[PDB]
Amino acid sequence: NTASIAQARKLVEQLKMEANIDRIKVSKAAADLMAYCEAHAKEDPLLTPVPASENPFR
Amino acid sequence: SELDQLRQEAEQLKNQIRDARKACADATLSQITNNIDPVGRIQMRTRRTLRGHLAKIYAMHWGTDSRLLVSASQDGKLIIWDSYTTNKVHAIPLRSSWVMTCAYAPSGNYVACGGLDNICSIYNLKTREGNVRVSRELAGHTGYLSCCRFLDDNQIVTSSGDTTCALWDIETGQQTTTFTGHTGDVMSLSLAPDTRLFVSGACDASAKLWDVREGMCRQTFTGHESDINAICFFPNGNAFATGSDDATCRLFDLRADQELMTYSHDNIICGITSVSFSKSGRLLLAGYDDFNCNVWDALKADRAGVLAGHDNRVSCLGVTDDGMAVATGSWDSFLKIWN
Amino acid sequence: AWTAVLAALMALLIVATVLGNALVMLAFVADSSLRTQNNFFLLNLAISDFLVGAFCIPLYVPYVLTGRWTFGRGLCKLWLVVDYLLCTSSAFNIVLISYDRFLSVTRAVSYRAQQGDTRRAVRKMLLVWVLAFLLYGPAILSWEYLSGGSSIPEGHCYAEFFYNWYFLITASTLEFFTPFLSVTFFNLSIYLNIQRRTRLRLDGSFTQRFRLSRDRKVAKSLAVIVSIFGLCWAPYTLLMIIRAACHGHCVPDYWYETSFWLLWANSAVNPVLYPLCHHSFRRAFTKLL
Amino acid sequence: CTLSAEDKAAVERSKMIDRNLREDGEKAAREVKLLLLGAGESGKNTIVKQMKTGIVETHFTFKDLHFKMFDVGAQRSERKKWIHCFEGVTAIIFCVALSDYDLVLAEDEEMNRMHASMKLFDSICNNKWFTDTSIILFLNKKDLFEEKIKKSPLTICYPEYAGSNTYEEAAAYIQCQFEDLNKRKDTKEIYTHFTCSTDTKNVQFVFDAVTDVIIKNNLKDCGLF
Amino acid sequence: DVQLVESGGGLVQPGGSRKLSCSASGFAFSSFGMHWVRQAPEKGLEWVAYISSGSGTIYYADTVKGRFTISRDDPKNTLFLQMTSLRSEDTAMYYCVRSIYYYGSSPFDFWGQGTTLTVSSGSDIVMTQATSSVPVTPGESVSISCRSSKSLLHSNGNTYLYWFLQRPGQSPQLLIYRMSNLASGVPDRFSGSGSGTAFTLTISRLEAEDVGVYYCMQHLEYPLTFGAGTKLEL
Ligand SMILES: CC(C)CCC[C@@H](C)[C@H]1CC[C@H]2[C@@H]3CC=C4C[C@@H](O)CC[C@]4(C)[C@H]3CC[C@]12C
Ligand SMILES: NCCc1c[nH]cn1
């Protein structure tokens, strides 16, 4: 079946295109997610509730 | 045989990808965040209850201003609420009551709806006649519409059960781009904060990262054992969280091309219907079929809180852009705002 | 002394009415799915029974035990009004529940549509209470002023009637005979409609035996409801009417008291019949456990 | 009362919206919703025509009862992801063609169409969302079944059959086989009707079955049952 | 096209009664509340009456309460004013104004053309516009000031101040519907600001089409009150 071969060729092309990625280290990604979570800790009302005078749903 | 060679080659590429991913596993996320102070118990209260839907609520979406809300129920109605006062701003009747998704345009001028009719309807909220009118109907999907998200005022992205995603130009009503590659139904969409990438989870138990302009699949993430029903981007746009029917959430990192953390418990065996992050990204909220929502510590994988108060399956979750409140909607016909 | 038995029995009743009925109310708050009109009617009946169990019986106990009423003429009228209101509201609720069930098989589609309404049920319950009060309370309170009152030797608390049989006949007919006949008619109509439909379906196995068994169960249920209501109430009504026409003669003293306590037994047994056979109330009770 | 004039105007607008929502809900609560299922070309279309690419809805009225019929064919996507959206339907109308016993699926010639219909029926009736939902079974194309049984015995698809090659017995055997698939006999009832291309009692039969379903639900909700 | 056409004016005797009608076309008439606003030959705008959508709430100005009746005919899309016991002070041009109220809406966004009715023979907020006229030149900016006797800032954060413009021989037109909120279809050259009781409307790059009378209105509480009107010339 020509169509089945075409499908396999498409899958091979996609796998090749996804294979060549400049993958960073997982420790680096964990460090960057932490850094982002720390940098914006005080701007998150649900993690650090705001005074009732500042709460629109009070 | 060409086919044998192709299949063998596919396997070689998959093994190469697996080895490249494993080579990047220097240290787990849980080891790095071992010395972080826990957030502690997070307790939230119900500030508002939104009544008026007469059937199951299937979707809701926050307005960009953090005050206006759109909810869709299969009683045939789309309702736009004022969350501070609980006033109903608009009630839009639908030609087809089998709605499964809704969206709010970033500018607030338009709303989107869709469902089992295979059509994405666009409603104009600000007309001269004073009504809400169907400004457009996008057709071209062969399966049910599962999720839609306004990429802009003239562009929208949709996913359906025909296993494909589509980027539509609303003005001409045509489909500008098609995203194929999933082998199952596409269940959820999540646009990036810069709107140049989007991620979708399918019933083939995988997620795919797509480039909007190119129209190409950038990455594929696996690890769930069942269907993926919900998906959300991390606030900085370099990671996302997916919830499936296997009763677990997972956090995937885009740059490492792997999975950082799993959020699971022994007392939870139902599926996950919805997931969203808090503004910082520290908390991960997930709604379940248990009739309630769990607040997880995204950086430590510990349950930080529970939101209970629905009598049926929690179907939809949202967090405002300013981070003030959460909204939950369930099959009990009620929406609740928490803070 | 023998009293240790008599009072003891009363104690059991005082709890059986208060506990079981309390339990019903608990389910109403325990489960949020118990919010249909029928459930509201069942609640109203539970409230009527509970108020009888906790207030009327405990206060009457001294009168039966000692033969004297403490604080006479200051509590006589309040106790009489409360007692008559509660009994008549129980009867009216029995009729209201029967009417709702009768509608469920005649106006089937209309009924299915209106079951959720919490306003219609509240309006019907308020009407029931209002009619129950208007039937008797005014005649208890506003009779001494008209006829000169008295007729009560020291402290006995009983209405200025009980010797004039015209008002007794009228009140009984508007309070028991009419509601009893209506309950009988509604239950018979339900049974006949169920029998007719099953027959047609058969004309059109385990499933067959199952339908017939369920029909038999319903037939036993309806019969039990009607029989218990009539049995508990008719004796006291007839005995009091007979007493008055005889002007105190004809009736042995022991019989009058026994008939009086049978109506209260009905308020005690009510939770067993209606609330306990409902499947939603059973589910709520199981959830409590 | 702490509200400005415009806030009071907005609240009055909300009250009018609630009023309209209540009216629409009251109107919708009186309608009988039916879910129509079948195994492809199983006579479903003939049933639709007699009684009257996403979901398709038909509206008809009989004896003051409004019926909304939802045909969910032409949805070649996973069923488990959208079946729960029909959880509250009054009844499921299931159509089976009686001639399929002598035919096989075009996509798979080794599979008999009757077995596919039985599998779909078994999946629908024993589904967890429809534990108490009754099924109205329409066995269509009965005429053609009488003209083929005399030449094609049921042993082709039912090897254990030991009856005569007469419609009267074959139809009863088929009805039994389809009703044997119900594993919830204590909760749901199945109504079976034999129909053909020229039948006018189809709507009356649906009316009777739906009336029985509604009355049984009302009784179960009032106690008694 | 949105359209409001008023009819029923003319000359009437003192003590008589006339019925004014306002026929609406091109919008969802039942979703809008309606106002009747009049302008005596003195060119000052006076709010007369208001009937909400659904006819739930009705308000009248004191000067006409008990003599005027406002009503609606939704199926026929017409608004009505019944005027009885007319007095010479009722001579004026009457405008039919539509106004819709929900979060983020734009009230007073369309005015009718008017009917000329001629008759032969304490707690209200006061709005002040000190300058009656201002000679201006094209291409230059202009500033128009408004003063309120009571603060227009509500506890919910809104300042209910409305700016209207009336060109020679035309109906008034909304420019700013809440302090700092430009109306739909209005050129960006108009801008507004203020605080509590002092408000300013600024016009940049003045055009010949921007010559007219500018009116200041408060929508904080009924009755609604207008300014005297500031006139631009040249
Ligand atoms: C627990 C419930 C269900 C049943 C038992 C109720 C008891 C308390 C009732 C049933 C019949 C009643 C008796 C009926 C007749 C008389 C005769 C009178 O001259 C003294 C009181 C006396 C003796 C009553 C006292 C209370 C009594 C014993
Ligand atoms: N209506 C009669 C009240 C009563 C009798 N017995 C107990 N209570």
Neighbours of A42 (CB within 10 A): 10
Instruction: Tell me: do E212 and E135 sit in the same domain.
Output: yes
> Is it true that domain A5-57 has CATH number 1.10.8.60?
no
Instruction: Tell me: do E136 and E115 sit in the same domain.
Output: no
| Token digits of residue E122 | 């304490």
Of C112, C214, C222, the CB nearest to D218: C112
In the reported structure, the alpha carbon of residue B110 is separated from the centroid of ligand 2 by a whole-number distance in angstroms of 67
E234–chain B Cβ distance below 8 A for any pair: no
What's the Rg (C-alpha) of chain C? 21
**What are chain B's domains?**
2-338 (2.130.10.10)
Ligand nearest to the Cα of C2, by number: 1
Residue B99, H or E segment: strand B99-104
Ligand nearest to the Cα of C20, by number: 1
Pocket test for ligand 1, best of C3, C10, C63, C253 (most atoms within 8 A of CB): C10
Residue C143, CB-side half-sphere exposure with 13 Å CA sphere: 18
In the reported structure, the alpha carbon of residue C6 is separated from the centroid of ligand 1 by a whole-number distance in angstroms of 7
B57 contact residues in D (CB cutoff 8 A): none
Tell me how far apart the alpha carbons of residues D66 and D33 are, in angstroms, rounded to a whole number.
9
Instruction: Tell me: do E115 and E139 sit in the same domain.
Output: no
Instruction: Tell me: do E138 and E209 sit in the same domain.
Output: yes
Q: Which chains are adjacent to chain D, needing at least 3 Cβ pairs under 8 Å?
A: B, C, E
C278 contact residues in D (CB cutoff 8 A): 223
C127's CB contacts (< 8 A; 6+ apart) are: none
Concatenating the DSSP letter of every residue in D66-121 gives EEEEEE--S--S-STTTGGGGTT-SEEEEEEEGGGGG-B-SS-TTSBHHHHHHHHH
Range of the domain at E88: 3-119
Contact by Cβ (8 Å): A23, B24: yes
Provide the experimental method for this PDB entry.
cryo-EM
Disruptive mutation site among A7, A33, A54 for chain B (greatest number of B CBs within 10 Å) = A33
Mind telling me how many Å the CA of D26 is from chain E's nearest CA? 21
CA dist C176 → C90, C118, C171, C181, C197 (Å): 11, 28, 8, 8, 32
Q: In what order do the strands lie in the sheet with E190-195?
A: E127-128, E142-148, E198-203, E190-195
* Alpha carbon of residue C6 to chain centroid: 24
Q: In what order do the strands lie in the sheet with B206-211?
A: B186-191, B197-202, B206-211, B216-222
Pocket test for ligand 2, best of C89, C263, C266, C269 (most atoms within 8 A of CB): C263
Domain end residue (candidates: E119, E138, E158): E119
Q: Which of residues 25-84 of B touch A (CB under 8 A)?
A: 25-29, 32-33, 36, 39, 42, 44, 47-48, 67, 83-84
Contact by Cβ (8 Å): B184, B163: yes
Question: SS3 breakdown of chain C: % helix, strand, coil, rounded to 5?
Answer: 80, 0, 20
Nearest to B111 by CA among B59, B74, B161: B59
How many domains are there within chain E?
2
Strand partners, B330: B314
Of B87, B128, B129, the CB nearest to E103: B87
User: Are B278 and A33 in contact (CB < 8 Å)?
Assistant: no
CA dist E138 → E145, E149, E203 (Å): 20, 33, 11
Nearest to B119 by CA among B133, B98, B93, B104: B98
Q: Domain ranges in chain A?
A: 5-57
Q: Which of residues 159-198 of E touch D (CB under 8 A)?
A: 160
E223 contact residues in D (CB cutoff 8 A): none
CA dist B99 → B57, B75, B94, B113, E166 (Å): 9, 9, 8, 7, 47
Helices (H), chain B: 2-23, 29-32
Instruction: Find the distance separating the first CA and the last CA of chain D, reported in whole Å.
Output: 52
Preceding residues of all breaks in chain E (C to N beyond 2.5 angstroms)?
121
CATH numeric code, D31-221: 3.40.50.300
User: Are C112 and D189 in contact (CB < 8 Å)?
Assistant: no
Instruction: Tell me: do E102 and E10 sit in the same domain.
Output: yes
Mind telling me how many Å the CA of A34 is from chain B's nearest CA? 7
Q: Which chains are adjacent to chain E, needing at least 3 Cβ pairs under 8 Å?
A: B, D
* Alpha carbon of residue B288 to chain centroid: 14
Size of interface D-E (CB pairs under 8 A): 38
Residue E59, CB-side half-sphere exposure with 13 Å CA sphere: 16
Q: Domain ranges in chain D?
A: 31-221
**B129 to chain E: closest CA residue:** E27
Q: Residue E151 — left, alpha, or beta (φ > 0 → left; ψ -120 to 50 → alpha)?
A: beta
Question: SS3 breakdown of chain B: % helix, strand, coil, rounded to 5?
Answer: 10, 50, 45
Concatenating the DSSP letter of every residue in D148-196 gives HHTTS-GGGT-TT--S-SSHHHHHHHHHHHHHTT-S-TTT--EEEEE--
Dihedral (CA of C281, C282, C283, C287) sign: positive
Contact by Cβ (8 Å): B230, B274: yes
Nearest to C87 by CA among C120, C57, C126, C123: C57
Strands (E), D7-81: 32-38, 56-62, 65-71
How many domains are there within chain C?
1
Instruction: Tell me: do E152 and E196 sit in the same domain.
Output: yes
* CATH number for the domain that contains residue C185: 1.20.1070.10
Domain end residue (candidates: E63, E86, E119): E119
D16 contact residues in E (CB cutoff 8 A): 53-54
Domain end residue (candidates: E76, E98, E119): E119
* CATH number for the domain that contains residue E16: 2.60.40.10
Q: Which amino acid appears at position C66 of this protein?
A: T
Strand partners, D68: D33, D59
Preceding residues of all breaks in chain C (C to N beyond 2.5 angstroms)?
204
